Amino acid sequence: RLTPTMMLYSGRSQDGSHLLKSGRYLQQELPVRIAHRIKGFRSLPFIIGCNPTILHVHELYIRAFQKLTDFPPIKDQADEAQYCQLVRQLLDDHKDVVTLLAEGLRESRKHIEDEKLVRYFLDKTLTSRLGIRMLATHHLALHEDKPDFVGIICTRLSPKKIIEKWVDFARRLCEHKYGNAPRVRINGHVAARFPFIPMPLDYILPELLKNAMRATMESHLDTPYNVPDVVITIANNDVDLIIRISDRGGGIAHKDLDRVMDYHFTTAGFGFGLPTSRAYAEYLGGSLQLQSLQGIGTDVYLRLRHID
Amino acid sequence: RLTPTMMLYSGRSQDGSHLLKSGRYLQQELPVRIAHRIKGFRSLPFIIGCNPTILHVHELYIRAFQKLTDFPPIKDQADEAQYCQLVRQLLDDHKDVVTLLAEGLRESRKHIEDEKLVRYFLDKTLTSRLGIRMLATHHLALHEDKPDFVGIICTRLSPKKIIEKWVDFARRLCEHKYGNAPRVRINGHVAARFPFIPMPLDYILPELLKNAMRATMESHLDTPYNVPDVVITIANNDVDLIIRISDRGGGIAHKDLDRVMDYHFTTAGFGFGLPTSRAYAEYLGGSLQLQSLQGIGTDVYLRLRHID
Numbered sequence: 332r333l334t335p336t337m338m339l340y341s342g343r344s345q346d347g348s349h350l351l352k353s354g355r356y357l358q359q360e361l362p363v364r365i366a367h368r369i370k371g372f373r374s375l376p377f378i379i380g381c382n383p384t385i386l387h388v389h390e391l392y393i394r395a396f397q398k399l400t401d402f403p404p405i406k407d408q409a410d411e412a413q414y415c416q417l418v419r420q421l422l423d424d425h426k427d428v429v430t431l432l433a434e435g436l437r438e439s440r441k442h443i444e445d446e447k448l449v450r451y452f453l454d455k456t457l458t459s460r461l462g463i464r465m466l467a468t469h470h471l472a473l474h475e476d477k478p479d480f481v482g483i484i485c486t487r488l489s490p491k492k493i494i495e496k497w498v499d500f501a502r503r504l505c506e507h508k509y510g511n512a513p514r515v516r517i518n519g520h521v522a523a524r525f526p527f528i529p530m531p532l533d534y535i536l537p538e539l540l541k542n543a544m545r546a547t548m549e550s551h552l553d554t555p556y557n558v559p560d561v562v563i564t565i566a567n568n569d570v571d572l573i574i575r576i577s578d579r580g581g582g583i584a585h586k587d588l589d590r591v592m593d594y595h596f597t598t599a600g601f602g603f604g605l606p607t608s609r610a611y612a613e614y615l616g617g618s619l620q621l622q623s624l625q626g627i628g629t630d631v632y633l634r635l636r637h638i639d
Numbered sequence: 640r641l642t643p644t645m646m647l648y649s650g651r652s653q654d655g656s657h658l659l660k661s662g663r664y665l666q667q668e669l670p671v672r673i674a675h676r677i678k679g680f681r682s683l684p685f686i687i688g689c690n691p692t693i694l695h696v697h698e699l700y701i702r703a704f705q706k707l708t709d710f711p712p713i714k715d716q717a718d719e720a721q722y723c724q725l726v727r728q729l730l731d732d733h734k735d736v737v738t739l740l741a742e743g744l745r746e747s748r749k750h751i752e753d754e755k756l757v758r759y760f761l762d763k764t765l766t767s768r769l770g771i772r773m774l775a776t777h778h779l780a781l782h783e784d785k786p787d788f789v790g791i792i793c794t795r796l797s798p799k800k801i802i803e804k805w806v807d808f809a810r811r812l813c814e815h816k817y818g819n820a821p822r823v824r825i826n827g828h829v830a831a832r833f834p835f836i837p838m839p840l841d842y843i844l845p846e847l848l849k850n851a852m853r854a855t856m857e858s859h860l861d862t863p864y865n866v867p868d869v870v871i872t873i874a875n876n877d878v879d880l881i882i883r884i885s886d887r888g889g890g891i892a893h894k895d896l897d898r899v900m901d902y903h904f905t906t907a908g909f910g911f912g913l914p915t916s917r918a919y920a921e922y923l924g925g926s927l928q929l930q931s932l933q934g935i936g937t938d939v940y941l942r943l944r945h946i947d
């Protein structure tokens with residue numbers, strides 16, 4: 332089973348030798364990908380790269396490269412176990428990176444000449460980071476013995492169930508802010524189950540659901556106690572999984588339409604939900620498409636390729 | 640009120656002088672547009688242009704140019720009235736032109752080197768023809784005194800009502816072929832009324848409805864007596880009119896997706912419905928977009944700009 336330019340190992344050897352193979356693989360893969368991202372930071376427009384917060388993330392990436400390269404060759408389970416400590420630390424050290432980049436770039440990007448430069452930098456940086464985090468988490472998860480998982484790969488993911496999980500989460504945030512939340516109905520292939528990697532859905536779904544719920548409440552300020560449902564349709568075929576999220580939140584206005592996919596743009600939480608979700612979907616071989624019915628609502632279509 | 644590179648006059652003079660102005664306008668506009676299309680025929684790949692049916696349409700276009708240019712200057716109501724006879728004849732003489740081109744091109748296009756050449760020829764020819772027919776019909780309709788119309792412009796078009804008209808039509812064709820037809824529900828801005836030109840909708844709507852109904856029946860061969868509804872949503876805003884037509888007919892397969900917009904392509908009536916509808920929508924400043932949920936259904940979105 333694989334993803335773009337990387338593979339997620341589904342080993343299961345008794346002596347635990349698959350952990351050594353996995354670890355050695357990480358050590359030959361992660362430093363290269365970190366190095367590529369450091370180059371990304373090096374080539375940022377000077378005035379952006381000088382931003383203290385951007386510099387901090389840059390330094391963090393240098394540190395990560397240094398720590399991995401300083402780690403001795405993995406020869407035994409004792410080494411592998413310490414390697415896992417390093418991986419856990421880095422995952423934790425880097426958990427706020429998306430937020431730091433958003434902040435650092437927010438002001439600094441208003442300065443430079445080329446406007447698609449930041450978009451390209453963020454698309455490339457955030458997707459490479461997702462890949463890095465997936466590989467690292469997969470390696471850790473190989474030690475686990477949860478049913479239905481091989482590392483971070485779920486062998487029988489139910490899209491309805493993971494959708495429901497994020498629905499409950501988004502409904503709670505929405506209720507806290509507006510005193511109510513749209514109900515969500517789910518239809519189509521509600522009983523589908525198939526091998527799949529949850530992690531990208533764990534980012535994308537709450538972003539799209541928050542969007543749809545905010546849009547619904549903000550357009551029904553007179554009747555917060557009675558708002559139209561959000562309707563989610565699951566289509567599962569041999570090629571891809573499609574999740575359509577349809578709201579009656581009034582639509583994306585014509586004057587806003589060409590901006591909603593830009594990092595930082597927002598009508599309101601830092602305006603990253605849509606461009607990030609799209610970059611993730613595309614990184615994984617899928618896509619994220621919007622259909623705006625101005626005056627009525629929006630349909631968002633998430634497509635993710637099935638596992639090979 | 641206007642459309643691309645042409646205007647539809649909303650005159651109403653008592654002496655009937657607006658009919659003379661309209662007629663003179665046609666005589667200074669139509670011959671030019673016919674001449675442009677004749678050039679189109681002249682530049683067709685030799686082997687296609689030699690097809691007897693293509694030659695017939697070519698000749699028909701030459702004849703139309705010849706008749707209009709042979710018609711004397713319009714100076715009085717007596718002239719204008721005879722001019723209307725000529726216009727009616729030509730409209731009638733040319734009513735099968737789309738069908739003739741489809742047939743003539745069907746075989747001949749398999750020969751030539753450039754594959755997007757025919758697509759371009761048909762997009763340009765069919766849209767210029769729609770423009771010609773709109774102008775000509777508008778001029779004729781100026782003699783009429785129907786309530787709510789100025790020529791072919793409806794001053795208070797109800798999208799729900801025109802949708803319902805074509806729904807009944809498509810349901811009857813479908814019922815005759817399959818012994819039943821999906822019901823259609825219409826929601827969103829069901830009470831919208833606004834100035835609008837019906838003619839393009841009169842072509843596009845039945846094409847999209849036939850598609851959705853065929854797809855629905857062909858995927859429910861076991862239960863023809865109980866098939867899922869087609870659902871149409873109307874969104875009316877200050878910029879455009881959006882009509883979403885959503886079916887549970889199983890979707891457009893991945894292997895077919897990149898072909899359904901090509902003239903001539905069909906899984907079955909001559910495979911012109913979709914590319915023609917899209918060319919018309921775009922000619923008028925709108926668009927036609929498809930979202931396929933393979934295994935479930937298809938959403939088709941027709942957008943047409945409001946009148947200026």
Ligand SMILES: Nc1ncnc2c1ncn2[C@@H]1O[C@H](COP(=O)(O)OP(=O)(O)O)[C@@H](O)[C@H]1O
Nearest residue numbers: 542543546582591597598600601602604605629
């Ligand atoms: N379902 C929706 N309905 C209406 N507007 C939306 C919807 N989803 C996104 N938007 C618009 O696109 C903008 C960008 O969204 P996003 O990238 O998620 O950033 P944020 O939600 O933080 O503003 C939103 O501020 C909102 O104006």
Ligand SMILES: Nc1ncnc2c1ncn2[C@@H]1O[C@H](COP(=O)(O)OP(=O)(O)O)[C@@H](O)[C@H]1O
Nearest residue numbers: 850851854890899905906908909910912913937
């Ligand atoms: N709503 C739909 N659902 C499934 N397939 C569709 C739908 N609309 C169009 N298609 C597919 O696209 C093809 C092209 O349609 P069209 O251009 O209207 O030509 P025709 O209907 O004559 O085949 C159809 O044959 C059908 O396979």
Ligand SMILES: O=C(O)c1sc2cc(Cl)ccc2c1Cl
Nearest residue numbers: 395418421422425428460467
């Ligand atoms: O930026 C990030 O989120 C992460 S997590 C992470 C984990 C490892 Cl083991 C190495 C680099 C790295 C980076 Cl860079």
Ligand SMILES: O=C(O)c1sc2cc(Cl)ccc2c1Cl
Nearest residue numbers: 703726729730733736768775
């Ligand atoms: O091709 C067609 O449909 C038509 S209708 C029509 C009507 C007039 Cl008056 C002139 C040309 C012309 C053509 Cl070309």
Ligand SMILES: [K+]
Nearest residue numbers: 591593596602
């Ligand atoms: K945004």
Ligand SMILES: [K+]
Nearest residue numbers: 899901904910
């Ligand atoms: K076609």
Ligand SMILES: [Mg+2]
Nearest residue numbers: 538542604605
């Ligand atoms: Mg958001």
Ligand SMILES: [Mg+2]
Nearest residue numbers: 846850912913
């Ligand atoms: Mg058709």
